[PDB]
Structures are given as C-alpha cells and as structure tokens.
C-alpha cells in the first residue's frame, strides 16, 4: 500500500503534495481549519482499496436486505420498547428519553406520519489473510450518515493520481507490478460512488411523496379559507436540515443539499433543535392527522433530515427535547424517525444476530430465505444479563472473545463477541494537504449506503401493493482508520 | 441592477453568504490566504455583467487582430528597442535588464528560439455616453502572466447557482437572466479549454521542431544521464503565489486531458535546477532541469513585476530560459508589449499601427482603431503643439498618465458582490472590465511553418473573463485585492 508514494519518489516527483492539495481544492474536498474561515484539504489516501468484482457486488446487492431489516424492525414498536427497556433504565437522559418518544408518538393512540426516509450506511470490514462472507458487518447506522456526498469526489482524486502516475511512468519510461487501477481499462477500475446522486434524489422523492400524501395544494387552499378575513404558506415545502450547535462535515452536507436545490428545485433550511424551540409550530388542520409543521410561520416542512441528535450533547435542554418531539409528532417524513434512529443502537445490532428469535421473525417476517443471505456477514454476539444460559455462553475455547477488551485483560473478568482478525495493511495517506503519513495496521472500512422510503406495514402506498415506495443500494464510501486517531477517506478499485 | 440582494432579502433568503461560500469551495473558485495553506473564496459578483451579442461578437473577433498586432511589433526587435530606451533610462533595474535581454538574445547575433506562444488578454471598458466607433474602449493590453483564464468559467457556474436559487425562491411564494429564456443567456467562458489546448499544441510544436526522439537518440550516444521520453511545460512561478487555483485549473487540464507534464519552479530554484546543453552552435541550446526534464515551454506566472527578480541569480535564470529552445510565454519581445509605452505607441496609426504592427494593412488597423482612447504625445520628439493648440478650444476633457489622453466617461452600473465573507452592495458605483483572452503560436516573420504559408500556427479568441470593481476604488485588479470576478450574460 506504499507503491504510489514509492513510484512518485523514485520517478523524481518531489512536488506531488502541492499538486494533490490543488486537486483537492478543485473537487472541493475540504474542511475548515481551526483558525477562522479558510478551508484546507480533507485527509485522503494516496491509493484506493482493492476489492473483487464479486465481493463488491455482494455488498451492493445486500443493501436492500439491510434496509429492509431495519425498516421491519424499526416499525415493530412493541419489540423496540421491550427489547431495549434495560438500556433505557440504564441511560435515562438519552437512551431513555428517546424510548419515551417512541411511546408518546407511536405507541399511544396518537396519530403519526407513517412514511419514513432511511439514508443508512452498512459498514463492513474484510476478514484477515463455512460458506460465510469474508466481509463481516461491523457497524449499522441510520442517523446522520456521513460522506454520501463527499465519497464520489474521492474517486476523481484517485483518478488524478492515476493520470499523474501514468504520465510520470511514461516519462522515464516504464509501464512495467502494474497495479492496474492506474491503467484504467478493464481488469481494474476505480468505481465511483453513486451516492452523490442517489441520496439527493431520495430526499427529493420523499418531499414529493409528502406533497402527494397531504395534497399540499389543497392544504394551502384550505389554509387560506381560514385567512379570508396572518402569514401565508409557501407554495412548496422544504427540507429541514437539523444541525448541531457546533457544525462539522459541512462540505458533505452541501454536496448533498446543493443537489436537492439545483437539481431537484427544493429549498433546504438549517436549524438547531434549540432554534426550533422558537421557530417550529405544529398546526393541526385535521384533528385525526399529524399536524403540519410550519417553521417561521411559513416554511412547510416535508422532510426533517437529521445531521444531528445522534450523540447526547445535541440535547442540552428540555427545549431541545421539546423541539425534537415536536417534529416527530408532526407530519414531516423524518430521516431518521425515532424508530430508524433506535436501530443504530449497538443493542440491536446485537439482537439482529439472533437468527431465529429476532432476524427471521421480527426483521424479515419469517422470510428466512432473505435473512439467511445477510447472515453470511455476521459476527456472533451474546448478551450478559437475564436468561440462565447467559452462563453457558461464558463457559464456552481459546482467547478469542471481545479501544476494547481482549486476551489477558478481558480474561481477568458490555457483551461477548466472536473474535475476527480483520485484514490490515500499511498505507500512504495525506493529511491537511502537506503531511504524508505512513500509517501502520491501517484497516479499511467499506460502507455501503442505502436509501429506503416505506409506508405502514400492510399498506398499498408503494406500487406492487408493496408499502415500500423505493429501496435501493445508494453507493458507498471507504474509511481507512487504524486498528489502534482519525480516518482518511479512501475509495474502491474493483478487480475481477 | 440592484435586484439580486433585494430579491434575496425580500424572498426571505437565509444564510446566503454561506451557501455562496459553499458553492465557491465546491466549484474550486478560491484564493490562498496571506497566512499559509488555508484557502478562501475569490471575490465574485452576485450577478453577471450584461453585453449585447453584437458588441460581444466584435470583441471576440478583434482578438486575433490583437494577437497579430502584438506578434508583429514584438518581432520587430529594433523597433521595440528604440521605443523603450527613454523608459529604460528612467528605470534601469527592471526595464533596463529586460531591454538588455532583448539586446542580448535577439539582437546581438546569437541564435534564439523563434517560435513564440502568446496567452494574452485585451481588456475593454464600455463608455457610458456614431458607430464610426465601438462603444467598448480598450484599457489595457496584457501579454505576461494573464490571470483568470482558468477560473473564469467557474464564475458562470457560480452565477448559474444564484439563478437557480432565485427561481426556486421566487416560485416558493407567488411568482432578466435569472431565467435562461434565451433572449438573455449566461455564456460560460471557453478560456479554461482553449488555453490548455494552446499550451498542449505549443509543446507539440516544439516536440516536432526539435524532432525529439531523434534528439533523445543522439543523447544516449554522447555525467550526462537518461533523458525523459517527453518534454515538460515549465511553469515559472512567483515566490509566494496565492492565485494557485487559476494556475492549476489550467495546468491540470494539460496533464489530465493533454497528457503533458507540468513542473513548477521559481527563478531562484531554476538557477540551481536548470542548465543549458548546446548541440549545434547554430540552434539555441536544450534546457534540462534536474538533469532530466526537457523544457519545451516556459510559461510565466511571474516576472511582470520587479519583486520577482530579487537576485542577479534570478535575471541569470531568466536569460537561461530565454536563450533556450523552450517556447516562451511570454518571450521578452512579447513581454515588452505589456508595457504602457507600447500601448501608447500603438495609438497613432499612420506612424506605428499600420506600418509596424500590421505591415501596411491599413484595413486591419482600422478595425482595432475603433476601440481606442486617443493618446497623443506631449513631451514630444515632434513639434507636438497642434494637439496642445487643439485642446484649449474644447479644453474640458483630456487628462494625462506624461501623455495627453482623451477623457472617456466609462459606464457605471449597480451590483452586489461577495468579498472577504461579507456581502457588499455597490449602488451606482461599479465598473466592469471585459477581458478577451487570445492565444497565438507563430514562427519568424517571413517563415513558412504554420497555416497557408503564414508563419502562424494558430490565432484564436480564447474565451473571456470579467472583472468588476468600485468606481471610487483605488487602481488595479483582483490580485490587488480591490476587484471581484464576474461573468458576461449575452443579450440579443
Ligand atoms: N455532524 C456530522 C456527523 C456525522 C458523523 O460523524 N456521524 C457518524 C454516523 S452517526 C458517521 O457516519 N461518521 C463517523 C463514523 O464513521 O463513525 C454530519 O452531519 O455529517
Ligand atoms: N502571479 C499570479 C497573478 C498574475 C497577475 O497579477 N496577472 C495580471 C496581469 S500581469 C492580471 O491578469 N491581473 C489581475 C487582475 O486583473 O485582477 C498568477 O499567475 O495568477
């Protein structure tokens, strides 16, 4: 994984890093330096990650099954409450207050917007060096998933090294190990993430789907009949992007949000939960339906797209929870709904491992057929609290069960897990555009994105009496982070 | 003209400065801070500048005459020398040393690389007052390190964002270039494309003239080490560049599209990195850098100001380049047409424009001659009295830079811009300066290489850029930190 950096130096390029910072700026792969304005480049790898056509294909093909698992589970509210009550009684001020909302909104008789937009990412890591997959699933996340916007840019940056290197080689010369991603045609090709286009369109199509549900034109016509006597309704609704009080990953959200505006013609406005305390008002128009959420007494909110609320600190006040509840209570298709949010919790990525009490019945409704395909990428997990055979699982061979605990420290004795040595390598990486760091024991984490928009279990809502309006692979990103501290963005070159 | 910032405030636009900064970074329209690595958006206007298709037409079509007029005067070495001698006597430590290179390389009978590559930009400004004249007057001719050929087309894309944004905002409550209607259309510059191709073709022309593979072969026959398979564009860069965006915007296309390598060096660097290797004493010597880089083109993004020549080392390096085979952009004789004196001499027609710069084509001279602000000559080699006698009939409209000029009242319009992270409204206080780029590649004055027996390999209009500025503002450009970039929108 140091071949690029080695070829560069040994082909007499000494000023490569300037260039690579310049290409970074062209594509707009950047981040604010701590001192005031003035953005500098993101941390990026000098080489892409290698991946079989087949293995890549498998990960892409399975995202719908993932999304579905999450939808099915998330909408199983009784299950969520029951299957998480102990984590709630433990973390009251966050995990608890989130479980309360599930209840007040979805589990009392109260009405609620049943459409939900998922923009998830499933993160796999490859197994080191059974018909199970080498790529084990290490992380599932449904809330403010990062890089769906930045990710494609990385491929264009890697295309640049490939070009530069081609000309540099020819210039000595020697194309003769070709590491064939450099010579674009066939055997190996840098695969551009489709997520910069698919995710803006999901958001787009969710706003559209909200408009059509509500008959927003008629909502206005009705609205106005009450004012035929203080603040008119906008003529289209908007995406409310909920941001943290200290916002980061900005380039990324713009790359997304700019496409929603320019390509799909829908306004995005940025709010903190705090700010919505005083901006957001619910407005009932039919008692038996979730209220319309106007912001500033004119913004109709079609989608509440969270780029926040995932960690406790974005809830520094009751007001913040008041505002967070207000949206959920509303009619905006949320991303994530609380249900979807609660499916990020590690406690459920564990539960999903139970392939017979949770995976098949709850998250696939008995389609053990489908369930069995996800299974391939599993790492067994095993709880520690009540159920008498939480001792038979501990009495079970050989120092291979997890910073984390493992080996001599774990031995001295939170949840059991099957130990997998993940594939590690050393990698050229470029930080701030001017420090080339040679990282060591660099893992690569491939994250395959999914977009889903679904209705109630059992509705007709989405065609072929589905209830799913759409469910699809949504591109990918790759993060290179050390096993054991900040990742670089990387990208896939697929070989067959 | 006011409209944009009023439409935003009115339509309830919100965080628009940040969105707009976002779009810049995303489009790669940026500028280095004075403090190291960080980059911030360029100053840009929140609306395009308007021009009629017919005037914009004539401006484009004039550019090849401009390139031609510059090519010829430049190549009339003895004329060029005589012209600048008083202006060199006044300033010996810059103009003098430059004029000395002309003397050395081109006049005293050495060999020199005869092929020359011009990346120019004639700027105009519309007067605000019959078609005996154009309404657009030429203000500066630029032949050394012309800026914005790379970034200009991004400015259209930025403005295109604003127009998209304003449609959506208008639509959202009830409800001109904002709409692509077709009777007013934002035209994106082609300078980002035509210029790289120009540098590409220049390398190609050098590669052919030298018959390089033939040359590379000889080298192995005649310590001297393995010489690269292909030459490079050498970009001679200022010691502390901020405008790296423009530079790379162009150069990356040379690499990625035209498969040709660029390398950046200061002069100071080149003094160590660059030696010359004579093959025949009748041809100018090859220039290799770092032992292996063959220099085919010496593009200069530096050298226009004295501050880039701190050391005699630096002038040395500059001569080495000049003496070399490399096609220069500019060559010294091109460089010297940037000077204010040549611009002032190109004014009188019978004496310099027709016989020098167009070789007795009065017709061509008469086209360019439609965009002139008459400059006359006080402190004269002639009697120079019958302009001074003329003036005090109608005395109220002639300034001087030393040299009597005619007093054009240049058009003032209204606009808003985003500079230094603030949104600036300029009410009836903004003048714009339309910059037509041009490229040229030519041989010796009577040679054959080039199209239809002419010494000219190519000569096109190369797109355009627009710069706007407060009218009450202090002298000069975007780099000076007083002007913003801008974009034309063309109206039938
Ligand atoms: N405020 C940031 C937060 C993004 C973030 O770092 N969140 C997590 C998901 S909850 C992520 O996918 N990136 C970090 C990681 O890989 O864990 C944003 O909206 O982009
Ligand atoms: N060294 C910088 C700046 C070169 C420069 O100052 N160019 C001048 C002409 S010599 C220009 O086009 N004017 C800057 C302006 O008008 O704002 C670069 O290569 O971009």
Numbering used by the authors:
A (entry chain C): -1 to 127, 134 to 180, 185 to 237, 247 to 413, 417 to 422, 431 to 441, 465 to 535, 544 to 555
B (entry chain D): -1 to 127, 133 to 178, 188 to 234, 246 to 424, 465 to 555
Please give the exact wording used by the authors of the publication that reports this structure.
Glutathione synthetase catalyses the synthesis of the low molecular mass thiol glutathione from l-γ-glutamyl-l-cysteine and glycine. The enzyme belongs to the ATP-grasp family, a group of enzymes known to undergo conformational changes upon ligand binding. First glutamylcysteine synthetase is responsible for the ligation of cysteine to glutamate and then glutathione synthetase (GS) converts the dipeptide to GSH by addition of glycine. The TbGS subunit is composed of two domains, a large “core” domain and a smaller “lid” domain that together form an ATP-grasp fold.
We have determined a low-resolution crystal structure of the parasite enzyme TbGS in complex with the product GSH. Four molecules are present in the asymmetric unit, forming two dimers consisting of subunits A with B, and C with D. The subunits are very similar in structure with r.m.s.d. values of 0.9 Å (A–B), 0.9 Å (A–C) and 0.8 Å (A–D) when they are superimposed with SSM. Size exclusion chromatography indicated that TbGS is a dimer in solution, and the asymmetric unit was found to comprise two such dimers, subunits A–B and C–D. The TbGS dimer is formed in a similar manner to that observed for the ScGS and HsGS with a non-crystallographic twofold rotation axis relating the subunits to each other. The lid domain is poorly resolved in the electron density map, with only a short section of anti-parallel β-sheet observed in subunits B, C and D. Subunit A displayed greater order in this region, allowing for model building of all but a short sequence between residues 443 and 446. In TbGS, the lid domain in subunit A is considered to be in an open position. Despite attempts to co-crystallize TbGS with ATP or the non-hydrolysable AMP-PNP, these ligands were not observed. The GSH binding site is positioned over the top of a loop linking β6 to α7, with further interactions to residues from the loops that link β8 to α10 and β13 to α12. The γ-glutamyl moiety forms salt bridge interactions with Arg324 and hydrogen bonds to Ser150, Glu264 and Asn266. The cysteine carbonyl and amide groups potentially form hydrogen bonds to Arg119 and Ser148 respectively. The glycinyl carboxylate is placed to form salt bridge interactions with TbGS Arg530 and again the interaction appears to be strictly conserved in HsGS with Arg450 and in ScGS with Arg467.
